[PDB]
A paper describes a structure:
Here we focus on human [name], a member of the plastin/fimbrin family of tandem calponin-homology domain (CHD) proteins. They also feature a flexibly tethered N-terminal regulatory domain (RD) consisting of two Ca2+-binding EF-hand motifs, which inhibits bundling activity in the presence of Ca2+ while still licensing binding to single [name] filaments by unclear mechanisms.
After 3D classification, selected parallel and antiparallel bundle particles were subsequently processed independently. In both bundle configurations, ABD1 and ABD2 bind their respective filaments in a similar fashion, with CH1/CH3 both oriented toward the filament minus ends. As a result, when bridging a parallel bundle, [name]’s [name]-binding core adopts a configuration resembling a checkmark (Left), whereas the antiparallel bridge resembles a zigzag (Right). Superimposing ABD1 and ABD2 from the parallel bridge shows that both ABDs bind a nearly identical site on F-[name], confirming our ABS prediction based on the high degree of structural homology between CH1 and CH3. Indeed, comparing the prebound and parallel bridge postbound ABD1 conformations shows a striking rearrangement, with an ∼30° relative rotation of CH1 versus CH2. While this conformation enables both [name] engagement by CH1 and H1 redocking on CH2, it also requires a substantial increase in the distance between the CH1–CH2 linker’s N terminus and C terminus, from 5.8 Å to 30.5 Å.
Author numbering:
A (entry chain A): 5 to 374
B (entry chain D): 121 to 240, 269 to 310, 332 to 377, 388 to 627
Write the structure that this text describes.
């Protein structure tokens, strides 16, 4: 039976077979609930929206994100999310198909245990596996040595891998990928006579961020250009009919990744995180780490993220040897493509978490099988 | 661009969901239309699906008779989708709000549950089932688990070889003849489960040469009857003195010993109710005349009336002589001319078995090592490598009684490869040197 690879994420959740070069599941991961009164009979008969079914009706509904930076709080909506991801984009039976799961690092044991039980009890799975997104994204670039910066919608972690081996003591996690960026953008959009409070405009704000916001090279120079000239002023067409125009709050939103002081947190930025991870590794393996910086996740596609990151790392470099930033075009699906490649291998068939072993092992079977 | 991409999906859904034929009033009924999306989004199939086992359930016209007024058609979708307790919409993400219109991915995900819960040697005998699949002309299914994946080709050939609990009756009708209906679950039958299907098809057609002992019959008459049966007589000779009274079998045997027969003087087996005895007497007289002058037989005191009246002595005196010429011809056509010998033909088996190499070598036909059928089966596959079949052979663990079975086993396929062996298994079990010689003579005919 063909293996299945599912890439879960706070904003986008991916699924597909093992071996395919193109993704299948392309949908926002949102939850909506009815909130208006139906004067006509036959309406109000839904518990929770999931994904594009709420995206297409984002006027009369709310938006709920059950995934909070890779943390699974309410499993009732996550059941719906996984049901959406699997049957609507695989159409195969997981009950007789192996499925490869993704999970953010530094995840408490309760989350992994519960997502394992859900697979082994709500579903009837013959053999599952749980893999780290950063490790899987390394196979997409065709390399086995170097750090991978996986930045989704609320998860930003750096797992350095050297010749297949990973360093547990050099693994950290940052909760700033796309969600706090969206919050910062919708907060700063109110400085131009705009109102952004309800979640019905959150998808529009995210789209505006995706098609306007870009990582700037020099923030002070961008401030000077925006204050003096008015050349970086691009307009957006609101779905209802009004026209907005933002020129300063475009490159301000992506700058929060490098400057955490905008949202007020004591953690460092994304450029210092990989440097600190490398510093936590061996001094004889930094050569393979500076020249191998594979980008992935839903965040790092801003127009000017690679050059800015290269400049930031070069400023942090001791001016000894070259820095290489890898930004593949399929950064949105590097994790899924790598998982499909790994599951397609003949070796990967011999450590899936089978149900018969789980029956006598117990809930902690994923903890030493993954 | 593309105007059509998925008409085959309609047929697939039909063959999968014929568990409930009432769903065919919502989904297309094999005419590849597009009625599925809107009505399935209303959940009508969910209430219909219960009619799989018992029709006494939510009726299609009882839950919905289209009192969905020309403005509000919003009442049927939630009313029918709330009855999704059966099978279970494992996609709990979707509500009846989005299913009001329907989405491709959502409909596919719900159809996934519909398909999943809606449904709950061997080859030598399988070919005796596949023989009828040819009909006018088409390929053969083989087992129900090998070639057919869906019900398309199976139903197409069922049109010629004519609820899954009742749709399995299509496969079981050829099994209901002997009562072998149960012990093969319809869910696995439709799903094409291999292991259940191989044995089920195999054991069915195991009963789809005559070696029996009559109450009164000498070994000589048994040899006669077996010889004529193995030579290919048009009737089936069961009694020597009751089937040769028409002299038709004798005439059939005549051309096989190179005696020309004029069939224009022979009365056909259809006999008028008047003068049939006269026609049979004429046939016997013509057979005697053909045996006398051009055939040079020694039959003193034998006439047509003796064969017509079934005189045992004179009939045996003719048949044994017929085999005398038949064996003479078999031993003469093998050589260059009119020479026949036993020592020239006894080392042939010793020489041709050295091509492969096996520990079977005989000195003559009187050796006791040919008491079992090991020597003949060692040679029967030397000429034809495709008949190895040592499954039923016995070597070193054979008693007096059990070697009859392997003797018959070795004799039976001799005609399969091409040796026109007219030998009883008993004559090979014993060390009768005259007729195992005929066995080897028939072997040499196909050998070279
Ligand atoms: N082209 C883009 N440029 C900038 N940001 C983007 C782009 N595409 C998506 N994003 C942002 O990234 C987040 C989506 O992350 P996601 O796709 O869930 O990551 P992952 O692939 O690791 O699961 C959303 O906030 C979205 O706004
Ligand atoms: Mg991700």
């Amino acid at each position: 039976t063909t293996a299945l690879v599912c890439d879960n994420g706070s904003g986008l959740v991916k699924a597909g077979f093992a071996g395919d070069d193109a993704p299948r599941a392309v949908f926002p991961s949102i939850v909506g609930r009815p909130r208006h009164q139906g004067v006509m009979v036959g309406m109000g008969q839904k518990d929770s929206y999931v994904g594009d079914e709420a995206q297409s009706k984002r006027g009369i509904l709310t938006l709920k994100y059950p995934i909070e930076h890779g943390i699974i709080t309410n499993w009732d909506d996550m059941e719906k999310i996984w049901h959406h991801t699997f049957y609507n984009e695989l159409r195969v039976a997981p009950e007789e198909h192996p499925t490869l799961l993704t999970e953010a690092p530094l995840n408490p044991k309760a989350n992994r245990e519960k997502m394992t039980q859900i697979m082994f009890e709500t579903f009837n799975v013959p053999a599952m596996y749980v893999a780290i997104q950063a490790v899987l994204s390394l196979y997409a670039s065709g390399r086995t040595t170097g750090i991978v910066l996986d930045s989704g919608d609320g998860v930003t972690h750096n797992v350095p891998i050297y010749e297949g081996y990973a360093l547990p003591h050099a693994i950290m996690r940052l909760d700033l990928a796309g969600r706090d960026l969206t919050d910062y953008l919708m907060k700063i959009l109110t400085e131009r006579g705009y109102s952004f409070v309800t979640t019905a405009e959150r998808e529009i704000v995210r789209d505006i961020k995706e098609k306007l916001c870009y990582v700037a090279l020099d923030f002070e120079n961008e401030m000077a250009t925006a204050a003096s000239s008015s050349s970086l002023e691009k307009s957006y067409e609101l779905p209802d009919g009004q026209v907005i125009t933002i020129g300063n709050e475009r490159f301000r939103c992506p700058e929060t990744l490098f400057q955490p002081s905008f949202i007020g947190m004591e953690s460092a930025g994304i450029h210092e995180t990989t440097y600190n991870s490398i510093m936590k590794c061996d001094i004889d393996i930094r050569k393979d780490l500076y020249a191998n910086n594979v980008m992935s996740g839903g965040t790092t596609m801003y127009p000017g993220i690679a050059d800015r990151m290269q400049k930031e790392i070069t400023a942090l470099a001791p001016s000894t040897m070259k820095i290489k930033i890898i930004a593949p075009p399929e950064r949105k699906y590097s994790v899924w493509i790598g998982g499909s490649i790994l599951a397609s291998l003949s070796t990967f068939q011999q450590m899936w978490i089978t149900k018969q072993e789980y029956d006598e092992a117990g809930p902690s079977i994923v903890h030493r099988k993954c | 661009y593309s105007e059509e991409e998925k008409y085959a999906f309609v047929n697939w859904i039909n063959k999968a969901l014929e568990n409930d034929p009432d769903c065919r009033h919502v989904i297309p009924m094999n005419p590849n239309t597009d009625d599925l999306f809107k009505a399935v989004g209303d959940g009508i199939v969910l209430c219909k699906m219960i009619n799989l086992s018992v029709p006494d359930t939510i009726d299609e016209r009882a839950i919905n008779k289209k009192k969905l007024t020309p403005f509000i058609i919003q009442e049927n979708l939630n009313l029918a989708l709330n009855s999704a307790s059966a099978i279970g919409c494992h996609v709990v993400n979707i509500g009846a709000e989005d299913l009001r219109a329907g989405k491709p991915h959502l409909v596919l995900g719900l159809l996934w549950q519909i398909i999943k819960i809606g449904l709950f040697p061997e080859e030598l005998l399988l070919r005796w089932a596949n023989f009828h699949l040819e009909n006018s002309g088409w390929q053969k299914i083989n087992n129900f688990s090998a070639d057919i994946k869906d019900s398309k080709a199976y139903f197409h050939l069922l049109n010629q070889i004519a609820d899954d609990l009742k749709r399995a009756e299509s496969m079981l009708q050829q099994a209901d003849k002997l009562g072998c209906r149960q012990f093969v679950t319809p869910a696995d039958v439709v799903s094409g489960n291999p292991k259940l299907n191989l044995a089920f098809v195999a054991n069915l057609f195991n009963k789809y040469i005559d070696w029996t002992l009559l109450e009164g019959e000498t070994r000589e008459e048994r040899t006669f009857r077996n010889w004529m049966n193995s030579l290919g007589v048009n009737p089936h000779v069961n009694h020597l003195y009751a089937d040769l009274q028409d002299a038709l079998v004798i005439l059939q045997l005549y051309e096989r010993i190179k005696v020309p027969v004029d069939w224009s003087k022979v009365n056909k087996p259809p006999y008028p109710k008047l003068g049939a005895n006269m026609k049979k007497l004429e046939n016997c007289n013509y057979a005697v005349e053909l045996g006398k002058h051009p055939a040079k037989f020694s039959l003193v005191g034998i006439g047509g009336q003796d064969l017509n009246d079934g005189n045992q002595t004179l009939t045996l005196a003719l048949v044994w002589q017929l085999m005398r010429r038949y064996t003479l011809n078999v031993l003469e056509d093998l050589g260059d001319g009119q020479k026949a010998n036993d020592d020239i033909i006894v080392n042939w088996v010793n020489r041709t078995l050295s091509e492969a190499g096996k520990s079977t070598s005989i000195q003559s036909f009187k050796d006791k090592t040919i008491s079992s059928s090991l020597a003949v089966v060692d040679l029967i596959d030397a000429i034809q490598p495709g008949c190895i079949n040592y499954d039923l052979v016995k070597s070193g663990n054979l008693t007096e009684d059990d070697k009859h079975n392997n003797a018959k086993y070795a004799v039976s396929m001799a005609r399969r490869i091409g040796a026109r062996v007219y030998a009883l298994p008993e004559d090979l079990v014993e060390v009768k040197p005259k007729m195992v010689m005929t066995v080897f003579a028939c072997l040499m005919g196909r050998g070279m």
